[PDB]
Design a protein around this ligand. Sequence first.
Ligand SMILES: C[C@H](O)COCC(CO)(CO)COC[C@H](C)OC[C@H](C)O
Ligand code: NA
Lengths: 125, 226
Amino acid sequence: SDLGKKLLEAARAGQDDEVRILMANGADVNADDMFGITPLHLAAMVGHLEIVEVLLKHGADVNATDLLGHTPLHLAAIIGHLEIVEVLLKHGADVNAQDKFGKTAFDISIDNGNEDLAEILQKLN
Amino acid sequence: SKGEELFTGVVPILVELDGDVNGHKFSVSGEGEGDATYGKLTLKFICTTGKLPVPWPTLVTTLVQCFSRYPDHMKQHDFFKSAMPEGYVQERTIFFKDDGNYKTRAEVKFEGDTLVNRIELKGIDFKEDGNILGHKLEYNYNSHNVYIMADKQKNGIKVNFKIRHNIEDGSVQLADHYQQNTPIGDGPVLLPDNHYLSTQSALSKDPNEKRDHMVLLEFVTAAGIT
Ligand SMILES: C[C@H](O)COCC(CO)(CO)COC[C@H](C)OC[C@H](C)O
Ligand code: NA
């Protein structure tokens, strides 16, 4: 709870040793804020690869959704962090997941001009 | 712009609205964070005067477009951040179809290191048993296109869009938004080519909060230029 809040803020800030220590001290890897955002959402959004891997190895939900139905993969498509996309998919992220307004990570990629990421995602159908 | 540098991380937000709708006086205070690199906003709002006399969804547009994401190919078109930190005045008239209207004036600017949106809202001509004063709006929100053009002569922007409010009977109440933004400072701003913002908003409750309140998550990305 208190550890959950700290875990969120460490994930957003890219503080990898803080993430590891917080989880060793029992922070819930799947803690969320009142907006439904988890540590894996934040690390995927910002492109913090080592944090994403640590969270996933400790059982972070790759299919977690925020209030808008965005998964970590949706958020990784905003800037287009390829190594993070790859890891999420290797852990079973649903490439076709739709947010509550029907948008996919492909759609987000296109909106951002992430043309190469869009091509990758398209080939996985 | 130099203004966009203020938005590269997480910025705390305060929102303070003073409202009068058909003589019903109310106040709203919000606080949270904006993460404009991702077009992300997270806010919680409280009615500080008791119960809100209008539905929460009718106030969402009134309650910081500087936190929109402008993708790399669109950075030259971001008026909102270019006006910062001195900020901008944001005025609207919102016409609820077959009902009354809101008029709003807001100042959006940095106060210390916090982005603050201070608003005055006046609503008139609402029907006592219409969808607004009768509270017939679903507690939800749609996804919109916010159309933007430069007003080069007045060094600002003009904005227009309609909000779709779902009604509990399956109908939709339209709210037609007419909007202008004007820089507060004398410094140069970015005057955009025509484009739009694609908006997504979700409304929730805090299970620990007993006051009349609204939890809001938004994601907004500019589009319409390739
Ligand atoms: C012209 C059309 O009916 C819509 O009218 C828009 C207008 C006049 O053009 C009506 O008041 C102006 O509304 C936008 C401005 C910014 O609102 C000013 C004040 C805060 O109500
Ligand atoms: Na409401």
